[PDB]
């Protein structure tokens, strides 16, 4: 691992170099964002150069008739007062931050960004082919300014801003296996309808078969007409006021009938993926960098505390097993007799061996 990232401003005064673009967030510590900025004071026109990591919600308005007019609401932003050393803020550079000065001299000034734990992960909401500008959701940006004071303006070429991700990966220890079950009793009798549901494991990786083992023990005089089965992305967005949606991403309404006083065991296999859920605008994809094709946004891993009504986009997943129970009898179609159980699992990427993320 001997390479670094660099993009400079239009006019090349301000160059920015960064270790990685992906800064991973184990629930406790977020890997600091460490890098350097080089100045060419042959063109040091201005008299101050700051740096800021920004956490922001990128949204296009419902009513905004402008193609690509996106706005950003700031959830978290901080500053390192780096060019040039402001009094007193003396800090030890990193393994990375070192080899960069040794390479470039003191023409380049450092910054370090200890991300806090209770922050969103870079998540991006699927667009429709309508929308055209920068992908919407939670994006991050290190920007590199030049402006005499903090209360000064920034010129559109006197600047560079890079996009980083704060991401998560699947935990090593497999959670306990998900089983939920339920039991409904109807008016017409005391013999009950029972539905048990089991996933084969608690953690699944993008593109992997989820296998749902069903067990309907029907002791009723009602019939189970069909059995919808579904994988649903729960979204918990928080920009100005808390929103929420639970859109389905994988489904199989196989028409198996459990007739009355019958058992039933079937093991329906089922795979999420983004090929068939591209119409579903606003669905959460993982963090997009400029405009590439992401995956179905991975599960968001909250702390054991579950601190607050957290900002950004808290994703989860949950398999649903709904039984469609024939109505009729005393109340006819008036009263609904269906029975469903929801199983929650985790869907993220494993830990990469060492290597982080056309023809990919």
């Amino acid at each position: 691992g001997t390479r670094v990232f660099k993009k400079a401003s239009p006019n090349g005064k301000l160059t920015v170099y960064l270790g990685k673009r992906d800064f991973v967030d184990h629930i406790d510590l977020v890997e600091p964002v460490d890098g350097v900025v080089l100045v060419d004071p042959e063109y040091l026109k201005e008299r101050r150069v700051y740096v800021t990591l920004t956490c922001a919600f990128r949204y296009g308005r419902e009513d905004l008739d402008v193609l690509g007019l996106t706005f950003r609401k700031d959830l978290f932003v901080a500053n390192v007062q780096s060019f040039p050393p402001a009094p007193e803020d003396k800090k030890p550079l990193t393994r990375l931050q070192e080899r960069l000065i040794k390479k470039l001299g003191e023409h380049a000034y450092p910054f370090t960004f200890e991300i806090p734990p209770n922050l969103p992960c870079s998540v991006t909401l699927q667009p429709g082919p309508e929308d055209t500008g920068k992908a919407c959701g939670v994006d991050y940006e290190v920007k590199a300014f030049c402006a005499e004071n903090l209360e000064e303006k920034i010129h559109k070429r006197n600047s560079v801003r890079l996009v980083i991700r704060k991401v998560q990966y699947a935990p090593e220890r497999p959670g306990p296996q998900p089983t939920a079950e339920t039991t409904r009793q109807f008016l017409m009798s005391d013999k009950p309808l029972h539905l048990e549901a089991s996933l084969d494991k608690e953690i699944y990786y993008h593109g992997e078969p989820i296998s749902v083992n069903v067990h309907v023990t029907n002791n009723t005089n009602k019939t189970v007409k069909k059995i919808k089965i579904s994988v649903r992305q729960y979204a918990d967005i928080c920009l100005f006021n808390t929103a929420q949606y639970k859109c389905p991403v994988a489904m199989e309404e196989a028409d198996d009938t459990v007739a009355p006083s019958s058992t039933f065991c079937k093991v329906y296999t089922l795979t999420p993926f983004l090929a068939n859920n591209r119409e579903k605008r606003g669905l959460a994809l993982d963090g997009k960098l400029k405009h590439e094709d992401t995956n179905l946004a991975s599960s968001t891993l909250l702390r054991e505390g579950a601190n607050r009504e957290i900002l950004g986009i808290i994703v989860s997943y949950k398999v649903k097993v709904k039984l469609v129970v024939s109505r009729g009898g005393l109340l006819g179609d008036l009263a609904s007799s269906d029975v469903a159980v929801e199983l929650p699992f985790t869907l993220m990427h494993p830990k990469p061996k060492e290597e982080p993320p056309p023809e990919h």
Partner: antibody
Amino acid sequence: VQLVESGGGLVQPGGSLRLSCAASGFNVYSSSIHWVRQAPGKGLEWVASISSYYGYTYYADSVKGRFTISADTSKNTAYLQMNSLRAEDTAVYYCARSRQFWYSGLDYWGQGTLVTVSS
Amino acid sequence: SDIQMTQSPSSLSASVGDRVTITCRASQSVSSAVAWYQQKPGKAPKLLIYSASSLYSGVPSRFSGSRSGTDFTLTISSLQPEDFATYYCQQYKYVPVTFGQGTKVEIKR
């Protein structure tokens, strides 16, 4: 833990061959499936790439209008439709696994199949 | 235009035990994202090295490569029998993925 290629043979220089790569032992949505036309010592040349999870197909330019890449993911297999096969496409065609997340070089190649096209 | 992935040695003989070196240069800047494969003829490639540094899992630890910038090297330290095969330099950052000419090694008797 496996990968095969069935089909492939001798065909006139005008018609069609199509190849069935009946994979096994993994998920067709976490891999990307490619075709490599190395042939007999001429070199190594890529043909095809289907990404089922995204549903995209990438094509080496020399096989655009007469080569088709498909995959019927129930059977975990994948296909190469070869209409208008010339004598240059004569080859030993190859099936090649991938990681969808993310692409880090071609994991697992298959036993291969001798395509042959001369008059 | 397509990238080329030309390796510096075309073929070569050398001694069972010593250090072997294949340079491969790309017609343009494929940052990292070079791959290497050995093929004893009659079989199909095993994969050796992805991303130009990382070696495949299941590979002889006597393998690794690197980049001097645009130039991409592959190197084996103390080889053995059944390593008598041709070695293939692959770039996969763009479509189409390019391959390498080939590089034949022979046990030198």
